[PDB]
Write a protein that binds this ligand. Structure first.
Ligand SMILES: Nc1ncnc2c1ncn2[C@@H]1O[C@H](COP(=O)(O)OP(=O)(O)O)[C@@H](O)[C@H]1O
Ligand SMILES: Nc1ncnc2c1ncn2[C@@H]1O[C@H](COP(=O)(O)OP(=O)(O)O)[C@@H](O)[C@H]1O
Ligand SMILES: [Mg+2]
Ligand SMILES: [Mg+2]
Lengths: 448, 370, 370
């Protein structure tokens, strides 16, 4: 015969009874176990229900700390069932003698009274669920539990993003596309229980970087362009000697290295047809002026016409000093002051990993153990436990060529967690001590 | 939303939802209370057992039926049973469902008023209705003409209907049913030395009656057969493993339906009561009543009951009439089935007693609307 | 602080704290006094011996038991045993600990009132309670339903329990236990020429009974086996170094439990007493009592006692019932274990008789609280 028929009932009861924070110590934690019948028959949930609005009531260990002997375990059933003033079992027909063992109809319906009186990361994936609520113009629900408190605003925005058993379909319509019908009962869809709407809408939209090599680019050029893209300048810099000619990107970089820019002196990218070359020349002159005096760069024999004309030697003379300044800033802002050091930051990964305990450890940035991404992927989830993601990682079975994939994987999601890594995967695959140190510094930026 | 159909019998409670083909909850209409000393700490602070749970722990309980002869005699235990049927066995909130209740004919008027007050003030159901059980038994058969013989645990009654019209002057009621056959079986079981005396033992005798009793087609021949041979003897095992044997008591118990003098009553049998109900009707409709004798209730489930009623009424009819007995296998739930049919009719939705009407006319509104 | 559990048996005293799994103190319930002239200097200075000191010096003492057949007959010696229990074996101040005492059923009410007065006035306990020994044996086992057979030094009693309810009308009590078996062994040992006549020699015969006696599964062929062959004979060494041998008395002594007529008693055996206790219970609980025969007390430690009870009750039950006897190895301390068990429960901490309650109702408060 049927090995299972009612796990959905366990889920339904959990959904509806999560109104009381402590009821899950008797009813299942939403895994569809059978712990409900015996402890509910003792009436423990009846005294639990007082914790719904005011936790300052009958504590779980104050009523029952197992002062029930190994062989006469009679006592607690009356001590907990006598507390049915809360919610109230209409069915004045049963009680402690029968609920000692329980009965299916009796339990199902006393639970019916329980249901009758029982009711009166996540945001990163939730934004792709709420972006459509803007429509012509309105506030966003975020999760269906925080903003909305009644069906008024919920239905008003549902009109733009389009018996409770049929009303829940109005919200599940966006879930119908991937079959997410069950495990979210209509009672809490309408009531907006928080923890259920968080994970349900987050997991629903979970499925909702340029590492190419050009035909003629050196590693230095690729690193410059990679940090151009990683730093978040508004134009997507593809060619260094073709996008900086307006100096607008350089002025943006100046802001990122904490050099002030007066944009009133800067000619906007919408240049007039007349004099656009002169406007760009003025911008390049201003960029050179901001690079010489306040940025303190050695730019001998460099003028604004050189950046306007894209002189590679003088432009590299500026972008490498930009690297130098930005890296210095990244090393200093981790400190309490102007100090920068490598051995006070290389042991940080070794000691912060002890908070979880994993077999990765590194003696210095020249260690060969960081040739694969194992050390960075180990550190990258220690501060953010929500990004464990050991699906694509390789361990012991990696070769020379396949570790590039896990290196790119770790570098890519480092920006997802919030580490502003501006390193190429090759800079991590090779033991380049001047760049993996920066990778660790950026990971520590979000770390502490 | 969906109307609730609750057929509160004397012995069993039948409950469910309108539109369903069978009642969802069928449990005994009893209340049990402890009869012995509690000695183990906080085992025993439960005061009342009611449903099948009162039947499983009956060895330490005194069992009370809140309904006798179709009259609710304990209104607090009846409230316990209604609470039980709404929340535990049906599992619904009554404030969201109109409720359909049943009742025997010729009953006291205060019984109907009290159940109306209970449904509107204790459960405050949005609407309700009280219907006659034999009328619902006609609905379950799909007919609109025929005489219904309803026999449950406490009351046996006859109601003739023609083309959808009742004849109230020909309605007949007999206060003899299954519970009286149980008590008579207990009385005659002592002739073999089997003694049953507690309310828990009455449930055992009821089980024996439901498993071994039958209606003789000719009582005097079955009596001579049992007096000659043991071929009618049958055995039953008691809950402690004792084995009892009965032969003659198997049919002497249900024979009381045809001979109420066994239990000292002066009333006529169910066959004569049915015939007398037909002879009180217009002579033009008697032919159609003779062809449509509908039985319902658990007491009409004995083997041979339809053959005996067919033969007895044939012996009473003018011979030229064609006697027909209708005895569907679902006889035990015809009242509930007909109540779900009636409560699912769109035309019935304006027959509900609403709470607004009750708030103005009080409990007396049930006599007008029903 | 913590509750004390003192199981004052007839022959042995079991005491300890609630929450422990075994009694901390287990000593004979005796008082010894010198019977010979004090010819050695300094040795005569002690007038009374209580615990194991009375047993080890019994060669120069007369031993008395303050309890016979579960009734305290010497109260000053019982107070000596209680002071020895609290101040020498447990080494606790009774004024700081609630104390749980035990008693047999059907006992005189004055025994329970006097021990309540003794605990509140002589020992000034903050609270106390008196529990039935057979109920505590269920508290020891794993069960809220079952019939308990308790057999210690003075009393054999049966208590049937279902769902934590006792049936007092079915409680049985027999004044035949271990001390009577020892006295019978003393009598039958004279057939081989051994004599034991002083109170010290009674303790020697008790050691022989506890070491060489067993229950025959069939007494008549064991009698024939011992009459033909010698294989049943076993030897025992007396304290002076003499050696005695028994090969028939080993099972004739414990047979008195099943055949009380060996000592002139008219009463039925423990198996028939258990069966009659079950047959006084309601017929709906007998199947659950037949499957739960709990053995308790030191007299239930004979080899083969459970097998013989299984065979005899099976010979009495309706064959369809599954007879089960439960005989845990800790049977000797089931009552004490159950007492420490009950005294630990937080739901029980309001059930204690407090001294303030006793200051109002006097010693009669024990009949209401317990
Ligand atoms: N197979 C059967 N044979 C004989 N009697 C029966 C059988 N089944 C049920 N009964 C009897 O019919 C009654 C069942 O209750 P029911 O017919 O529902 O009456 P009510 O509606 O008043 O509770 C009881 O008296 C029961 O003993
Ligand atoms: N293994 C054994 N075999 C036979 N008799 C025993 C055994 N152990 C104890 N007894 C007897 O049981 C009695 C003690 O049991 P107990 O339950 O302590 O009685 P009480 O509680 O009344 O003192 C004594 O008569 C003792 O001789
Ligand atoms: Mg009925
Ligand atoms: Mg004892």
């Amino acid at each position: 015969y049927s090995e299972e028929e009612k796990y959905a009932f366990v889920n339904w009861i959990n959904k509806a009874l999560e109104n009381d924070p402590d009821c899950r110590h008797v009813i299942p934690m939403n895994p569809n176990t059978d712990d409900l019948f015996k402890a509910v028959g003792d009436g423990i949930v009846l005294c639990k229900m007082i914790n719904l609005s005011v936790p300052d009531t009958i504590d779980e260990r104050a009523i029952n700390k197992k002062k029930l002997t190994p062989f006469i375990i009679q006592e607690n059933l009356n001590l907990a069932l006598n507390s049915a003033s809360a919610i109230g079992c209409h069915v004045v027909n049963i009680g402690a003698e029968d609920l000692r063992a329980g009965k299916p109809h009796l339990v199902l319906g006393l639970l019916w009274q329980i249901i009758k009186i029982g009711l009166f990361p996540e945001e990163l994936l939730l934004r792709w669920a709420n972006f459509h609520l803007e429509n012509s113009g309105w506030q966003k629900i975020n999760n269906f539990s925080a903003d909305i408190k009644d069906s008024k605003a919920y239905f008003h925005l549902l009109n733009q993003i389009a018996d409770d058993l049929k009303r829940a379909e109005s919200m599940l319509q966006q879930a119908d596309k991937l079959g997410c019908r069950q495990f979210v009962t209509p009672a809490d869809v309408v009531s907006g229980n928080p923890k259920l709407n968080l994970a349900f809408v987050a997991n629903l939209f979970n499925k909702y970087i340029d590492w190419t090599l050009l035909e003629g680019e050196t590693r230095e050029e690729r690193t410059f362009r990679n940090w151009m893209n990683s730093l978040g300048v508004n134009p997507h810099v593809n060619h260094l000697y073709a996008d900086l000619q307006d100096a607008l990107v350089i002025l943006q970089l100046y802001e990122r290295i904490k050099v002030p820019v007066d944009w009133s002196k800067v000619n906007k990218p919408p240049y007039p047809k007349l004099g656009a070359n002169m406007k760009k020349l003025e911008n390049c002159n201003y960029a050179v002026e901001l690079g010489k005096h306040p940025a303190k760069f050695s730019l001998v024999g460099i003028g604004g016409q050189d950046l306007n004309d894209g002189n590679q030697t003088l432009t590299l003379a500026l972008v490498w000093q930009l690297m130098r300044r930005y890296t210095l800033n990244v090393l200093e802002d981790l400190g309490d002051g102007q100090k920068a050091n490598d051995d006070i930051i290389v042991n940080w990964v070794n000691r912060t990993l002890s908070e979880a305990g994993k077999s990765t450890s590194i003696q210095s940035f020249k260690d060969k153990t960081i040739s694969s991404s194992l050390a960075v992927v180990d550190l990258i989830d220690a501060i953010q436990p929500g990004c464990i993601n050991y699906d694509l990682v390789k361990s012991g079975n990696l070769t020379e060529d396949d570790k590039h994939n896990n290196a790119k994987y770790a570098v890519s999601m480092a920006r997802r967690i919030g580490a502003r890594v501006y390193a190429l995967p090759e800079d991590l695959v090779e033991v380049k001590p001047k760049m993996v140190m920066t990778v660790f510094a950026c990971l520590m930026g979000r770390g502490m | 939303t969906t109307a609730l159909v609750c057929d509160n019998g004397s012995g069993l409670v039948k409950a469910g939802f309108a539109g369903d083909d069978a009642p969802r909850a069928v449990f005994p209409s009893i209340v049990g209370r402890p009869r012995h000393q509690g000695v183990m700490v906080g085992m025993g602070q439960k005061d009342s057992y009611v449903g099948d749970e009162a039947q499983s722990k009956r060895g330490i309980l005194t069992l009370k039926y809140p309904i006798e002869h179709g009259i609710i005699t304990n209104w607090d235990d009846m409230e316990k049973i209604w609470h039980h049927t709404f929340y535990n066995e049906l599992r619904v909130a009554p404030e969201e469902h109109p409720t359909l209740l049943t009742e025997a004919p010729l009953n006291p008027k205060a019984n109907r008023e009290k159940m109306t007050q209970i449904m509107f003030e204790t459960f405050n159901v949005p609407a309700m209705y009280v219907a006659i059980q034999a009328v619902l038994s006609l609905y379950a058969s799909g007919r609109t003409t025929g005489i219904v013989l309803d026999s449950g645990d406490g009351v046996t009654h006859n109601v003739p209907i023609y083309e959808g019209y009742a004849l109230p002057h020909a309605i007949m009621r007999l206060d003899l049913a299954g519970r009286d056959l149980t008590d008579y079986l207990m009385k005659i079981l002592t002739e073999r030395g089997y003694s049953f005396v507690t309310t828990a033992e009455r449930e055992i005798v009821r089980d024996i009656k439901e498993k071994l009793c039958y209606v003789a087609l000719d009582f005097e021949n079955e009596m001579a057969t049992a007096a000659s041979s043991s071929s009618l003897e049958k055995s039953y095992e008691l809950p402690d493993g004792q084995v009892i044997t009965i032969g003659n008591e198997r049919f002497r118990c249900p024979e009381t339906l045809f001979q109420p003098s066994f239990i000292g009553m002066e009333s006529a049998g169910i066959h004569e009561t049915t015939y007398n109900s037909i002879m009180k009707c217009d002579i033009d409709i008697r032919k159609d009543l003779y062809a449509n004798n509908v039985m319902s209730g658990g007491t009409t489930m004995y083997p041979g009951i339809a053959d005996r009623m067919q033969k007895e009424i044939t012996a009473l009819a003018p011979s030229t009439m064609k006697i027909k007995i209708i005895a569907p296998p679902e006889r035990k739930y015809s009242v509930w089935i007909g109540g779900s049919i009636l409560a699912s009719l769109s035309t019935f939705q304006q027959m509900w007693i609403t709470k607004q009407e009750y708030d103005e006319a009080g409990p007396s509104i049930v006599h007008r609307k029903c």
